[PDB]
């Protein structure tokens, strides 16, 4: 879909990170609030049926 709305950070400092498994969009959608800043107009869908 067309995007809904449209400098520096410290947590993104590449000296302080450990990438053991690289984040992917499946994770960013499974856990909307853990894996995303400013998650707005979001539904949190989950199912352990």
């Amino acid at each position: 879909f067309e995007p809904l709305v449209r400098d520096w950070n410290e947590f993104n400092d590449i000296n302080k990170i450990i990438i053991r498994q690289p984040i992917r969009t499946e994770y960013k959608i499974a856990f909307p609030y853990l894996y995303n800043n400013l998650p707005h107009h979001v539904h949190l869908t989950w199912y352990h049926t």
């Binding site: 950070n9 856990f31 609030y33 800043n37 998650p39």
Partner: protein
């Protein structure tokens, strides 16, 4: 076991007191979600799982406080240990050069530390019961049991501070004077970690040379504890850090 690590910030530092109000409210509404304002200046949360932290921040951003807040990636809280015995000694002496403390370090076995965690070895016993337990199960020495002073980090901490140097050991006047501060400094070093500020686990420290200032007065009493934890660090870091 709470193991997951999440640092959080407001986007504009201005509304940090409101973000603090929110972290209060979540800490009160949650049983073991544990928050700490870490020396780096940050706000870290320690938690259980992905779904746990998800609904945490769901409520945080949804109800308690409505600022925009940045969130770092999840990491772990760590542990520190050794692999083999401190082959030599660095020994610390009080700022006023009054007390020389020689101690070394080595690894315990996992099981007994497990029991320390199980409350099975509760030293709320008498040293006699300590000895029964220890020598019974894991071929500990009876005198090693006599030598066990305490356990480090807190009520249940898997490391052990032991005192074994007989002729200077029967200085129960000056040592039985100094045991309190000794334990303060021991649990200090164990809790604050020698390397990365996370907890140590399952490690054995043994006091082998306690040259005490005669009348270990407030000079000792006050300037003794950092010396003790420096002994702890010397042993550990000297002969074999591990994560």
């Amino acid at each position: 076991t709470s193991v997951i690590k999440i640092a959080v910030e407001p986007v504009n530092p201005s509304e940090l007191p409101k973000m603090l109000d929110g972290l209060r409210k979540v800490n009160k509404s949650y049983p073991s979600l544990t928050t700490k304002v870490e020396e780096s200046g940050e706000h870290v949360i320690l938690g259980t799982g992905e779904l746990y932290l998800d609904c945490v921040m769901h409520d945080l951003r949804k109800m308690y406080s409505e600022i925009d807040i940045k969130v770092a990636d999840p990491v772990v809280t760590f542990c520190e240990t050794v692999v083999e015995t401190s082959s030599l000694k660095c020994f610390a002496e009080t700022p006023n050069k009054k007390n020389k403390i020689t101690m070394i370090a080595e690894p315990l076995e996992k099981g007994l530390a497990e029991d320390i965690e199980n409350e099975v070895v509760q030293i709320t016993w008498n040293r006699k019961k300590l000895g029964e337990f220890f020598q019974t199960k894991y071929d500990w020495d009876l005198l090693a049991a006599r030598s066990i002073w305490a356990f480090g980090p807190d009520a249940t901490g898997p490391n052990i501070l032991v005192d074994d140097t007989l002729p200077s050991e029967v200085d129960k006047a000056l040592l039985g004077s100094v045991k309190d501060s000794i334990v303060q400094g021991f649990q200090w070093g164990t809790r604050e970690g020698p390397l990365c500020d996370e907890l140590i686990r399952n490690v054995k420290f043994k006091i082998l040379d306690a040259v005490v200032a005669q009348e270990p007065l407030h000079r000792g009493g006050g300037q003794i504890i950092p010396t003790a934890r420096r002994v702890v660090y010397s042993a550990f870091l000297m002969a074999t850090p591990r994560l």
